[PDB]
Every structure is written in structure tokens, then in C-alpha cells.
Amino acid sequence: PAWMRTLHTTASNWLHLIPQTLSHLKRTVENIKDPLFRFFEREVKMGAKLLQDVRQDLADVVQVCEGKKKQTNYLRTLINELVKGILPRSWSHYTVPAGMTVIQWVSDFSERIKQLQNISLAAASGGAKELKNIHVCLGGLFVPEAYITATRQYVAQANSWSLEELCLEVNVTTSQGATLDACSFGVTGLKLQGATCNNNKLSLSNAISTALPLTQLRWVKQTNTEKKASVVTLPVYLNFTRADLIFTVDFEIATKEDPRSFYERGVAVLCT
Amino acid sequence: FEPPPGVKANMLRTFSSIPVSRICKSPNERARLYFLLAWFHAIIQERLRYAPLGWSKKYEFGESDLRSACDTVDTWLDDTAKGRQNISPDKIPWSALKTLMAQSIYGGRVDNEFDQRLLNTFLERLFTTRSFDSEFKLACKVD
Amino acid sequence: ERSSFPRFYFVGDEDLLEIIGNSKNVAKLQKHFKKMFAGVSSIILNEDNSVVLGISSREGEEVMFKTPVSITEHPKINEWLTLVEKEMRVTLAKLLAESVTEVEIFGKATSIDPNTYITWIDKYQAQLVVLSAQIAWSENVETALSSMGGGGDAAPLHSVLSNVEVTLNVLADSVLMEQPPLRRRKLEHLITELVHQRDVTRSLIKSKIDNAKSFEWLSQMRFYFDPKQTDVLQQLSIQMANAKFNYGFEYLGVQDKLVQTPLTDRCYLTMTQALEARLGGSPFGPAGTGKTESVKALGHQLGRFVLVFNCDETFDFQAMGRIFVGLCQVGAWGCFDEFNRLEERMLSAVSQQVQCIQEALREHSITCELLNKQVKVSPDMAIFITMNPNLPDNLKKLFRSLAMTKPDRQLIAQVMLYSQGFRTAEVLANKIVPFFKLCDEQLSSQSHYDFGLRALKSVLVSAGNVKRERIQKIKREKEERGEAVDEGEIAENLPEQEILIQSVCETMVPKLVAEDIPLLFSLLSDVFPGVQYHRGEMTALREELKKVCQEMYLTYGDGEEVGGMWVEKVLQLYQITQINHGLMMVGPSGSGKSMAWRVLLKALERLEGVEGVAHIIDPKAISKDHLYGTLDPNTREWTDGLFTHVLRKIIDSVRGELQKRQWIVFDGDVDPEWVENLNSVLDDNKLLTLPNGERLSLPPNVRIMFEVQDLKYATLATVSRCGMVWFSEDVLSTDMIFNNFLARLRSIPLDESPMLQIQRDAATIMQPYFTSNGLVTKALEHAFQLEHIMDLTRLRCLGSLFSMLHQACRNVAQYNANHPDFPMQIEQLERYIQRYLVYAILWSLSGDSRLKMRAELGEYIRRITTVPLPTAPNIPIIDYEVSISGEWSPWQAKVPQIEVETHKVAAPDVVVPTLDTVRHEALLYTWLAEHKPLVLCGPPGSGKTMTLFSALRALPDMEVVGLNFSSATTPELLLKTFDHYCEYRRTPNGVVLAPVQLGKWLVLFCDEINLPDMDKYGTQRVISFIRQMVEHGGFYRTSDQTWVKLERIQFVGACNPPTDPGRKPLSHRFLRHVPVVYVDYPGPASLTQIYGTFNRAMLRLIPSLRTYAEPLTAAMVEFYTMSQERFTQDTQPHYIYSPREMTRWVRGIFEALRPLETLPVEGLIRIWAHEALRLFQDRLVEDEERRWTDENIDTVALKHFPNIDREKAMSRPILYSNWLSKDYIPVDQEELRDYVKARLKVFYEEELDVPLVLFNEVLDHVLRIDRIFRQPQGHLLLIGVSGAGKTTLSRFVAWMNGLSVYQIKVHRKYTGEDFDEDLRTVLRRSGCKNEKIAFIMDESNVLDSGFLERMNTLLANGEVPGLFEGDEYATLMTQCKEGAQKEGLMLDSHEELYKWFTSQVIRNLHVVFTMNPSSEGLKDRAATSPALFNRCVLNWFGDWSTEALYQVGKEFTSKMDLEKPNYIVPDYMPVVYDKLPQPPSHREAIVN
Ligand SMILES: Nc1ncnc2c1ncn2[C@@H]1O[C@H](COP(=O)(O)OP(=O)(O)OP(=O)(O)O)[C@@H](O)[C@H]1O
Ligand SMILES: Nc1ncnc2c1ncn2[C@@H]1O[C@H](COP(=O)(O)OP(=O)(O)O)[C@@H](O)[C@H]1O
Ligand SMILES: Nc1ncnc2c1ncn2[C@@H]1O[C@H](COP(=O)(O)OP(=O)(O)O)[C@@H](O)[C@H]1O
Ligand SMILES: Nc1ncnc2c1ncn2[C@@H]1O[C@H](COP(=O)(O)OP(=O)(O)O)[C@@H](O)[C@H]1O
């Protein structure tokens, strides 16, 4: 059947596209003490497991396509989902937009695995200290709220502060013109929909989306001072479907702006 | 059969659905309130079509919620204005309407905190004594 | 009757009948009051039991009626019930008035006196004092707003807030010091409400509200009390927003107060608006957000009882219908929990019901149709539906919605901390809540992990208890050292972060896996920085544990010492017992959970002086209806379940068990079917609710624990509702098990002392090998690396090794007994024990694997050990045995050389001894001496059933009972076997099940122990039951729910590999107790020996051929070899080969030879070829397979019989028949065709006239089928495309041989009972009549798998006991009696005539099964019912071949004349018929 031949073609194409393997992080007592290393090791293990599962499933599909392997119930269900264009349930272990088809999912998985491979290489080259200074895309991670919590824990442990007394400040600056302080963590890929951010100041704009060059998350002691009238709280959704709420950022609107207009127009930060 | 899109069409359907006698009661201001309610309802429903942007999910802001809001307005206006032909716009129980239509009606389906914030913004913009002036703007810089 | 006073309408028909019958027995009415009241569990009466003095709640708080209701004055049940309810409402209102006046005296006060406040709290109820505080605060705020109405004036409202503050202060001092638990709950509720009132008053102050009608005040829930109101019921009115509700005034007793967090307030507003608008509310949202609780709190605050149903997948309707109509008549609220879980049809039905009720409610804004009855719906009725993400389409317009997206955990804590009396509660809450978020996120995911709200709540309650205990300890120290006592001083100087850390650790560390323990500490270092805790050792408990471990022969240790981890786990179990009533010891089997809790119970008994009693209940083995209790659908009688029975026994306090410590251990797997009922017990309410409605209060001394190995299937609800203790397999190290075995061997004698001295000497000998990193440990580590047929469990291997060493000690004792002159000296004893130990590791660790891994283990142990070993160059130590002289002697010498009798060839009973036979006989002897159940696992056939049977019949005192387990096996089968062969007797220990035959060990052989199907939760009921009697030494009789101890009963099982289709792997917990021996197919040498013996015994009939016995057997084996190598099971599901085929071969050759007095070698080769074709060729599917088979048998015949003629011995027409000749001598195909054609003509004349063309395949088929009918118990599995003639030939053969054809007329309504009755008729028609029946079955006639199960049992036993019972069985008995009288056999008892009936059926009845060639369907049929593939012989009709089609065409188109002389032969003839004549005629061309 021609469907079998074209499924062979697309399976081979994806097996070429997806990276080969992922390297687990090396455990160490000092690394175990570090929370960022723990979070990144969990992410690496999850990514490696999912990558191995997907690669083995694609290899089994290819072997069936040659006729060398018979379609078991799991393999038959996978083939049916592939032909119908629906995302297999086994593959989807992280949160994914509902309408995303298989090809886009494979592309996203490839990008995430590339990011994880770079992260593992950087960690192996240095350690947790280098792991602190890695600019990581929140959308690329499987659980970005875990990353936010990990940064909070790292800042609390470095300065011997308590977790509940720390608050988050966002500094949106260019990647080249950025300062990596002790409490500052870089994040890329955030996109602002409904507004433009210049000099950490929000301005209303008609553009559909303005890409934030580099967002610096800084954990600071609770000043216990009321937020100014120009301070606006913007949600950070994981994808464009706006079903996942990672956290909330606080920005300073420009003068002559109205925060109610910001609320009405649905201005929000998106991970991807 | 589908409802014709358009704030004008939505308001016309809302006004046709409500009996004419109810909107014309002892307080002459009551009709004004109803109009505002209709407008607000229309706006809310017309933000459903832009689901990712206007809201976070396709809520069921159906006719039942509109009927509940009309009943709430009726009861609170009757309690505040006990058979008075005219009532001052300040004396209108604005806070009761805003709170009830932010938490009980139109807010029971709202689970996202930011959707609740948007609903509160809309209610505080529309339902106020300042609406009873001829300078009130139902919308700003439309075109 | 129920129409008047609808309040008792709540109960069903059962309780109505009971209250009508026992109306005068008021003491028996307490269950009804427990059912319908919320808090009232009993009514307080006098000694005369004639006047209702008051009411009493489950906690012990009671209310005395101002004017008691006299039952004598109103004999009618309804009249005095209504009087009691009215009295309770009026008295509650009067007490509310009194307490409101008292608290108003307390209100408006600069300071309050603690003694007066505590006295006021003690005087009234918790609900009443909370309501009085609410009323007083509401009135004070209303007065303040009335004063403020002027506007721009001074604010005494501050004072009101200050008032609350000051009284809050005294509360913060009341809970610090020790209080009675009831007053403690009262103080907790009062503190929670006072904190809420202070917060809302602060909000009012901030808002500067100065008008009483301002909506900011109107939103808050307000209470108004009007003494002036004539009706006490209407005195209290709860107004919030525009909604108004009259207070229920119904006694709630004491309930858990819910801190009113922002969300809960929003919920209150939304639900009150919905109820005012006369439609219910749906608080949809995720799990554990307050959805259900919030509804219950709203109902209780209005004085109403909410009935919270559970909408699980297994949901009852008639109970739901009765409970719902009861609520409708009562007017009490009803909440639905997780509506979406309901089945779509179930959902639609319940949605329609609630739609009708809601429509009635809106119409009331009055009776409605419910269960074909008129139900009066009170206006106060309300309905709530909690959902998890929508509402059904018919309900979307009838119900408001509300979002419980996220609970206010940060406040819930703060408020509960201030309730416990903690200072700096804000910081502690802001630390603890994110800490639990971290635990829920950062810790590795596990099935038993739980970090939800319920956890926070519990952890905080435990922290409050810990702080109170520490306060008491410091107070006692101050009493002993000095005299300055000041509770405030102790509280101020008391660290509180340390208390929270200690409580968190005591509650959560036990459930943490080995890897997650450090992370938690790091998490604490992140949340509670710089503050550390140190666990307080229990020195007295450690000493008691050491003594009990010494008494029980267990290893005890401290810290890093051996057994330290186990001791820490026992201490953690003790702490969880202290801080919880529901426990769960999770961990892989073999972690010591059972012994951990047993040792802890014994140590607690010996320490505290409170004797402990443990009830071990297996939930899965018993039925859930028998577990919790049965309510008869018609007689409505309630019989308490096992758990219900033991709980009622404990509550009754008959023999002081309330004094004792009762531990109910639910040993067994847990699934969300039975434990759902236990969810009402594991919560803080601690009550068991039965379907009859009767609720039993859980005594404080009772602890519920689930000794469950895995939690992959338990719901998160139960996980969150009980404490968890994790027992990793690393807890019980191997050294501990070795020490336990050695101590038990040294201490207890094996018989029940000389052999005790022998055991001590043996333990001294093997002590070097049992040390840490010894021979046994390294051998076990290597054995885990190999592959085994079943799952490897460390305790299984260790238990088998210990049993075999016990057998070694018994052998030493026997040798000493038989040699009184010379008992075995020390050197020979060391040699024997060392060699037997090596042999014991060899046969214990690798006793369940193939020979290659057995040899691998042998080589490894040879490399690593120092014990002397046999010097055989290639023979492994396994074929060697250890003699009583301590020497390595070959097993071959133990193998004799017997010559079977000629008439006994291939007989079922005879077993030819060989290497595998003797080795497995020795292993079976050993594992039967200790009565240890064992499992013989191996491929089909393989000599497993017979090898076991030979051993068991060799044993004299052990009778055998076989039980063919099927895919539908249930413990009722074991119960039937027990009541058939054993009997219950009352003994001083208790009731005991023992065989009716004295001094006999009944062995319940189970033919297929892994066949039974597992439930949807991975549990096999029969396997769990067998494990239960094996490990607990007994089971539970459900007729009276009593512990039955098994006496002289042991189990033995056999099974095919679990990897085979239709085979389920056994539980690890069960596999721990049963050693598995892998009986592989006998090797070529074993087959050669066994069947050379059979051939030599066979050929004694014809001496002139005797000398050919040796090669023939080889040939018979030789060909067979490549058969098992060529047609593997991968190609086809039925392509299996076993020594059973070879035995059938020998039997067939003997049957062919016995008639004939003399016969040359060519005739013998012809018989052998005929049998090879009839065994190894009909099963084949493809033509090339048959060609290969024929060529291979040809080659084998020439290889082993070279000096023979191929044309005569191996003539192509191999047709054997007894139709023409008297004897079974081969017949030419043509003469056979002529005879069967004449028989077909007679068939046409007599039976149905259908023309049948006689192609050569029909001859072969009519021969094989006739062969099968002639042999007793001849059963066929005909396979072929439909219409090929399977039934056509079956009917023909049955008519020819005299068998009456019987087919079952199957239709759509042909139920299982109809098939059962047809089977009964056939059984009557076969055995009772001595009339042979050809039973025609087609898979179309099969409408259910149960048909196949009954057929399986019939094939495997020649009968099915299930069909014939009671009057039917008596009719059968009469019939077989008449039949035996006619035939000439005089038998009286039922058993002998039943056996004669079974023999008659097995010799007469013949069942055939026709099927189409569905290979996947073939595999499913084989897996579902093994008997159709076990002994049923199956043929491959397939489809008519080209030759067959050609012959059909010619014979049928013989009448028409396609004889055309003008036909010319073409140059190219498209030949498709193989034997087409070289000139095609016109007719030949047309047929082609
Ligand atoms: N402290 C100990 N020292 C030495 N041996 C011990 C100790 N505790 C238990 N054992 C032994 O180890 C084995 C543990 O059996 P036990 O039934 O307690 O395990 P389990 O994990 O509860 O298994 P199951 O869940 O199947 O009941 C037994 O042979 C027991 O005698
Ligand atoms: N406002 C609250 N005050 C006190 N406890 C609460 C509150 N909200 C929720 N809880 C607790 O949280 C848990 C949620 O249980 P439940 O109400 O059954 O949740 P759900 O119905 O969402 O499954 C319970 O232990 C409940 O007592
Ligand atoms: N040592 C032996 N002596 C005699 N017959 C044997 C021996 N080993 C195997 N057989 C033959 O193999 C067959 C084994 O079948 P059986 O053990 O009943 O299968 P299962 O154990 O699966 O029920 C028997 O028919 C028997 O004739
Ligand atoms: N040897 C044969 N010659 C001619 N017709 C046959 C032969 N065997 C079967 N049939 C035909 O098959 C029909 C019955 O098929 P049946 O045996 O019921 O199919 P199944 O194989 O499903 O049992 C009869 O009508 C008969 O004509």
C-alpha cells in the first residue's frame, strides 16, 4: 500500500531529523547540593528517556515498514495515529498545545533535545557554576516553572535567605548588553503580545508580538513596599493557546498609559 | 441557524428577548441600567470570538447568565428604590451589581485569575455613576 | 405512612420495616437515628426506657430536652418521633438564646475572665457556641454601623474589632495548656471563627464603611436573632447578600470547622445566590480544592445535614434512588462528588432524576415523581454537583457554576496554626505552604507520595500536638526542678520552627524513598534556614524491641549496625501509629513489613502493659459484599461483613478489647473498589458507613493498616487519607535473613534433643558459608544475573534453600536412627553438609531455568567455592547427588533399568525412570517433606503432571486431588473442594479444617495455577487466596466470618510458562512462598532411553522383528527432533510438539501391531510411516510443509532402515483402515473408495441426501476422523474454510460407526442456561444410556467464553460437576443406578456410580469442534481454553485443492454434454489442473 511507503518515507525523514542521543549529567555531592543541577539533571533524564522511546518507536515503525516486524497492538495504534496525523499519546509526555500535529511536535522535540544537549555539554565542561550562567528558553524546557523555582532556591541558598521572603524582578535587556549578576538568570524566547518593552518600560503597540531579547530574572528581598500605580502584572503563558500559567511578571508602564487598557487588550508574555 | 455577529445585532437580540414592560418600570433609570447590561453582555460575548486574545478559553456566557444579571438588577433596584419614580444615579447600588456580576454571574465560569481581573476592569469601567452623564464613553478610540 | 413526618423517609425499606417491627424496642432504634441525624447518634432515656430525655452525639456531647418527650403518651412511632424532633429543635433554639445572652454579657467588655469563658464553652455545644459568637459579632457590627449612619463621626467600630482582639487573646492562652479533646475542638472552632471575624472587621475598618445597608457589609454572612419572635425556629435568620435562609436548628453534634478563606466566601456568596434564585450550584474545579467540604460547611452553617455521595465508576442506583428520595422528603441537602466519573448511561439517568427534582424545586418557587412514587420536596431542599475538568446538557440551564481553581493554603495554615496556639503563625504558614509545593514538585514522583491540602492539615495538627506535649514536658521538668510555673513563660521561650520541622519529619520521612531523604533536608534548609531538629530516641522502646527480637530470633541493631535500618523503620511505624489511625506499609515483598509490625505490636504489649490483638484480613480473596456486609435485595436483612463483624466485636467491648490495642491489618493488594468505603473511616471523622446506613464509630485503640506491596492502582484519595511508611528492599539485608534462618535452626527442633543437637552441629558447619560476602551471597548475586522462567525473588530462593537444608538435617537424623551402633561422626557430617549445601545452592538458585544457565551457575560456583567438587571433565554437579556417606555419586546409578510389560506400553500410569525423573523426584520428596507448596513450570506436556503424580502416589499418606483451574477460576472452587474432601471441627484453638480421612495429607494439585484471569487491577483472586492460606496458615469462613486454621492441607501447582499466550505471571508475594522447578522437555538421550524401553516391550509380540527395536526408536526420536526444530510455535499457534506426540506414536504402533500375529519389516515401516503422517503432518498448513514432512520421513526411513525396499514399505498410498479387513492392515485407495461409496449410497438412502463427490482428500479425512471416533474420548478440532465439509464428514462417520449426531440448535436467545441444559441432556444421553454421541460444535454455536470453559472442563475430566446438582443430581443418580443394574454392576454409593458415569462418558461421548482457519482466532482459542489444544487432536481440512475442484466439476457436470468434436487442441493450453490428460477434451477443458 502507498500509505505504508509514505509512512516509511516520513519515519526515515524524522529519524534523520531528530538528534541521536542525550547524555545524562554526572552526579556529584556538591552538584547534588546545588538545586539548579538537580533540576537540570531531572530535565536531562526525562529528555533522554523520551528521546530513546521515540527513536526506538520510529525504528520499530521502519522495521515494520520493511516488513521485517509485525504490527503489535502498541505498534498498530502508533501507526494508526501516524497515518491519521494525530499525536501519539505515548510520545506526548510534556505539555503541548492541543492543535499541534505530529510534524510540528517532532520539530519542537528536536529543538528541545538540541537545547538539552547544549546544556549537558556546558555542564560537563564546567559544573554548577557554569550551569548558572546558561541562557535557557523557558518554552524549550519541559517544566519551566520548575526552573523558576530552581532559580529561587539557588538565590535563597547562596545568600542564606528564606524562600518565602524572595520576590522576582524582570529586567528586559539585549543579550549583548546584559549583566550577569549573582541573582540574575538569563532567559530567551519570551515574546510580548500587545505591547513593546523598551528600557524595561511597556508601551502600547499594534504589533502582534514583540520578541524580548533577553529577560533577566532577579530574586530580591521583599521590600514590603506597595507596587507603584505604573506597575502592571502580566501573565507568562507557555504557548499561544494560553492554557498554562508559568508565573507572573511585573513591569512599569510608560507615562500616559492606562493599566486597564493593558488588561483589556490581553497583553501577555509567552514562552513560545 | 447562527446568531449574526455584531455588537449591534447582539444588543438588538438582547433587547428583543427582554419583555418591554420589565425594562419600563417605576424607576426611570432602570432602563438605562438594562441598556448598560446589554452592552456589557454584548461586549463579553463578542470577546469570545477572539478566544486566545479576548479571553483564555471559550466560556459559556449564554443567555442564562444574562437572565440572572437582569434578575439581580431587578431585585437590587426594587430594594434600593422602593417605589420611587426617580432615583439619583449615586444612590444606585453600583457596588452590589459589580460584585455580584464579578463573582456570582459571569464569574462562576471564570477560573483564570486574569480573566477575573479583566471582568472586574470591564465592570468598574461600565457600571458606575459616571455612566449617567452624557459625556460617558462606552468605548475609547474605536477608530 | 412516611408521608406524615417525612424525616424518617430518609431511610430505606429495611429500616422502615425494622422500626415498625421494633417500635416498642426503642433501644433498637438508635441505628435509625444514626442514619438520619447528622450528629445525633443516640437518644438519652431513663432506666424505664419510656421517656426521651435528650439526644447524644457520636463524640459524647449530649443535649437534655427542656421538656422530655414521653413515648408512653404517644405509642405511635411517627408521633413520638415528630415530638422528639420538634423538642430537639426548640431546645436547641432555647440553648442558643441562653448562650447568645451569655456571650452578649461577655460582649462589650474591656477584658474577659478565662474561667467564665471556659465555663460558658463547656455549658453549651461547639456548634451552639460558634453560632452564639457569630450572632453577637453580627449584632455588634450592626450597632456600630447604625451609630456610623450619621457619617463623618467617631468610630467605636474599632472597639468592636478591639473586643474581638481581646477575646482572641484569651483563646490564645486557653489552647496552650492541656484541655479535654472536646473542649479542644470547641476552642479550635471558636478561634477559627474569631479570626475570620477579626479579618472581616479589619476590612470594614479599612473600607471606612459607615452605612448598615452598604453592600460591603451586606455581602458578609450575617446572623440575626429575634427573641421577640413567637416561633423559636424563625428566631434565627441567616441573611447574606439578598439571600435569606432560616436556620435549620438540627443537631450537628461536633463537626470539623472550615477556615473561611477568600475562595470559600466567594463560594458562600455564589451558592447562596443560586439557592435564592431556586437552582443548585456546581463548584467545578480540580481535586482537593474544597469543592465537597465547602458545600458541607455551607450546609452545616445553615444547620443542615449534607449527604455527600461518591460518584465512582462502580455506583449503585437503587440505594441512590432511596437515599435521594429520602433527602427530598427530608429537605436536607445532597452533594455529588466527581459527577464526571459516572458511566455515560449512569450519568444520563442520574441527570434526568436531578432534572426532575430541580424542576419540582423551581415550580415550588408540592410533590414530584420519584421511583414511581409521589415525593414531597421541601422548599429547603438543595442540590450541589461538584465536577472535575462539563455539566450535562439537560442541566446546564438549571445550575449555576463556580470555580474552585485553587484553595487558599497560605491562609488555611495561618488560621489553623493560630488555632493550635502557635505564635508567629504567619511566618510559619508562609514557610510551610511553599515547602509543600516544593515537596510536590521537586521530590521524585511516587505512587505513595502525597503533598496535598489534607497533608498540610494533618501535619499542622500533629505539630500542635507535638507543641502541647513539649509544653507538658517542660512543665513537668519545672515541677521537678523548682516551682515557678507559668504557661506563658514556657510558650514565649519555646522554639516553633523546630516544632514544625519535627512534625514535618515525623509525618513525611517514613514515606520517603532512600534517595529522597537528603533532598527533603535540603528543602528544609531552603525553607527553614539555620534551624535543625534531632530525633528523640525511644530507649525503652529500643530495649523492648531488642528483647522481642531475641525472643523471635530476629536480628536487632542500632544505627549503622546490621538491622539498624529495620529498627528505624519500626520506630517510624510506631510514630505513625501514634499520630495516625490509618497506616499503610508500602514496599516490595520481602522487606519485613509483616514482621516489622508484629514485632512492634509485641514490644508495645510488653512495654506499655496493654496487650495487643491483631486481625489479619485479606480483602481481595474475600468478596467485597462479604467484606463489608450484605443487604438482602428482598428480605432486607443486614449481615455484617468480615471487617464490619470485627469492628462491631471491638466496639461491643465484650472482653475488654477497648482496653486492648486492636490492629486490623489489611494484608493484600488494594484497589479502588473496597477501600472506597474505607475512605469514610480513614478521615478525621473515623466512622464506618454501611449501605443500610448504620454507622459505627471507630474506637481510638483501633488502627487500620494496609500491608500492600505496590500502590500503582490505588487512588490519590486513599493515599492522602492515611500515613505512609515505605519499606525498601534494602531494609532487610541478606545477612539478616541468614541470621534468622540460623537462629531458628539452632533453637527450634525440625520435628516440632538429639536432632536439635544435629541441627546445631549443621548450623556450626554452614556458619562460614552463611557469613556476609560468603558463598551463598555471591552465588545469589550471580543467580540474579541469570534468566529464570519466572520472576526471581530473593526470599523465594532463600526459602527453598532453607527448606532443602532442613531436609539435609532430616536425612542426617534418619541416618543416625538407622545406625545406632555408629552415629555419623563429625568429619563425615561436615563433608555431607558441605556437599549438600553446594548441591542445595545449585538446585535452589537455578532450579527454575534452562540447563544452560544451570551449567553456568555450576561453573561459577565451582570457580568461587572451596568445597570439594566432582572431578567430572564435562558433567555438571547437577547430575551428581550427595550420598548419606558425604560423597558425590552420579544420579545415573540411582536410575534403574526397568522393562515395562508388553500390554503396558504407553500406558498412562507407567513412568520410565531417567535422569530428569529421578532428580525431580528427589526435589519433590524434599519440598513435600516440609509441606512447602511448589510449582512445576514447563512447556506443555514435558512430563510435569505425571512426574508429580508418580511422586505423590509413591508417598503413602498424601492423597491427591486434582483441580483444573480455568480462566474463570474463583475461590469458590477451593471452598467446594475443601467441603468435599475436608470438614470443619471445633477445637480449643478454634475452628479447624481437616481432611475427613485421618492421618492423610491432602495435596490439592492445581493443573493450571497461572491460567486464572487477573482483575483490571492486576490481581488474581485464587492466587491471593492460596497465598493467604499458605502464609497465614488458614483463611476466613464467610458464612460466619471466622478464622479457619488449615490442618493437614497442602498445595501443589503446575503451569506453563507465563510467557506463553493466555498465561499471567504470578504475584511476587505468592512466588516468595513457592519454589518453582522448571521441567524442560526430555533430552534426546532421555527420549531414546524411555522409548527404547517402550519399543522393546512393544515388539515382544513379534519376536522375528525384535532386533529392530533399537534403530526404530532412534528413528522415532530422530525425525521428531527436526519436527520440534522445523514447525516452531512462531509459524502457527498449533505448531507445538512434545513427548506426548511420541507417546501417541508408540500407542498407535502398538494398537496397529496387537491384532497381527506376524509381520515383516516393511509392514512395520509402513505402520510407522502411517503414524508419523497421522501425527506430524495433518497439523500442517502449507503444502510445502507437508512435502518437507514426507521427504524427511522418507530420508529417516532410509537412514535407519537401509536394507529395505522403498516401493513397498513407503508406498505413496498410505491408507490404513479396518473397514474392509477385520484388522488394521493397509488398504488400497481404490477399494476403500468403492466401499465408502457404497456406504455413501446407503447414507443417501437413509440420512440426508446431499451428493458428495469422492476426491482423494475425503478418503484421508474420513479415515482420520473415524480413527478419532474409534479411540475412547476421541475429540477433534476440525479446522477448515466453511463449506469444505467438516460437518458433512463428521455426520457421515458418526452414522457409519453408529454414533448419533447431536448438534445444539443455537439462536440469539440461546443463553448459558440453555447450553448447560443441553450438556446435561447429552451427558444423560451418553452415560446413562451407553449410547455413543458425536457432539457437533461450531464456533458459531459459541456465543460466550463460558461455553468454552465448560467444554474445557468436560474435555479435561470427561465430565463437569457444575451441570448436575441437587434434584438434577439425584435424578442422575437414579438413572445411573438403573443403567448399572441393566449392565450388571451393583453399586450403592453416589461416588462409585458417579465414577462409573464418568467412565461411560469418557468411553462413549465424542465432542468435535469445527472452526474456520483464523490463525489469530486460533491463538485466542488456544489461550482462552487450553483443553482444545491440550488433548484434542486437530486436523487441517483447509480448502479443496485443484484436484478436488477438478473432480467436483467433472462429477457434477457429468450430466450435461459438453462433447464438441469441432474442438481443436490449442498450441498453448492454460493448464491449471495438475493431472490434466495430455489431449484436453472439451469437457476436460471446461472443467479446467
Ligand atoms: N529483623 C529481622 N532480622 C532477620 N530476619 C528478619 C527480620 N525481619 C524479618 N526477617 C525475616 O525476613 C523475612 C521477611 O518476611 P516478611 O513477611 O516480614 O516480609 P514482608 O515484606 O512483610 O513480606 P509480605 O509483604 O509478603 O508479607 C522472613 O523470613 C523473616 O523471618
Ligand atoms: N477553606 C478551607 N478550610 C479548611 N480546609 C479546607 C478548605 N478548603 C479545602 N480544605 C481541605 O482541603 C481538602 C479538600 O478536600 P475536598 O473538599 O474533598 O476537595 P475536593 O472536593 O476538591 O476533592 C480537605 O482536607 C478539606 O478539609
Ligand atoms: N519419564 C517418562 N516416563 C513415561 N512417560 C513420559 C516420561 N516423560 C514424558 N512422558 C510422556 O509425556 C507426556 C507428558 O504429559 P503430561 O505430563 O501429562 O503433560 P502436563 O504435565 O502438561 O499435563 C505423557 O503422556 C508421557 O507419556
Ligand atoms: N466431499 C464432498 N463432495 C461434495 N460436496 C461436499 C463434500 N463435502 C462437503 N460438501 C458440501 O458441503 C455442504 C455442507 O458443508 P458443511 O460441512 O456444513 O461446511 P463446514 O465445513 O463449515 O461444516 C454440503 O451441501 C455438501 O454439498
Side-chain angles (χ1 to χ4, degrees), chain C residues 1280-1299:
Chain C
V1281 285
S1282 97
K1286 290 107 58 187
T1287 303
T1288 314
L1289 293 200
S1290 284
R1291 299 156 41 69
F1292 176 46
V1293 179
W1295 169 84
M1296 160 175 327
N1297 278 17
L1299 286 90

Side-chain angles (χ1 to χ4, degrees), chain A residues 238-255:
Chain A
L238 189 130
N239 45 62
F240 68 99
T241 72
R242 302 200 182 186
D244 313 328
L245 206 178
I246 315 303
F247 60 105
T248 73
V249 299
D250 278 359
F251 280 115
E252 306 179 2
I253 70 193
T255 326

Side-chain angles (χ1 to χ4, degrees), chain C residues 137 140 182 246 290 298 434-435 580 603 756 870 878 944 952 957 1045 1057 1091 1219 1277 1400 1406 1467:
Chain C
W137 164 81
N140 291 359
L182 173 59
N246 159 296
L298 177 63
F435 170 68
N580 279 318
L756 193 69
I878 297 160
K944 305 183 298 301
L952 306 211
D957 260 6
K1045 162 102 173 63
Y1091 289 130
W1219 285 334
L1277 178 74
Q1400 274 314 280
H1406 280 58
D1467 219 350

